[PDB]
Amino acid sequence: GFGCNGXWNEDDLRCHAHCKSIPXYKGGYCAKXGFVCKCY
């Protein structure tokens, strides 16, 4: 995943990095057992 590779591998930092790299987003929080990278 995009940093979110599960409960024991929840790198929301990298999820944020990912989403920040996407235009129209400013960040990205890691959700759903640390599996879903959700950009905002």
Side-chain angles (χ1 to χ4, degrees), residues 1-12 14-40:
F2 301 108
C4 300
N5 303 274
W8 306 105
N9 199 148
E10 182 192 272
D11 199 275
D12 66 275
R14 188 178 308 167
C15 175
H16 177 99
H18 171 68
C19 302
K20 187 185 180 301
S21 179
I22 306 179
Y25 293 114
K26 57 165 290 182
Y29 60 94
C30 192
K32 195 176 186 62
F35 280 107
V36 174
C37 178
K38 192 165 291 302
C39 309
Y40 59 90

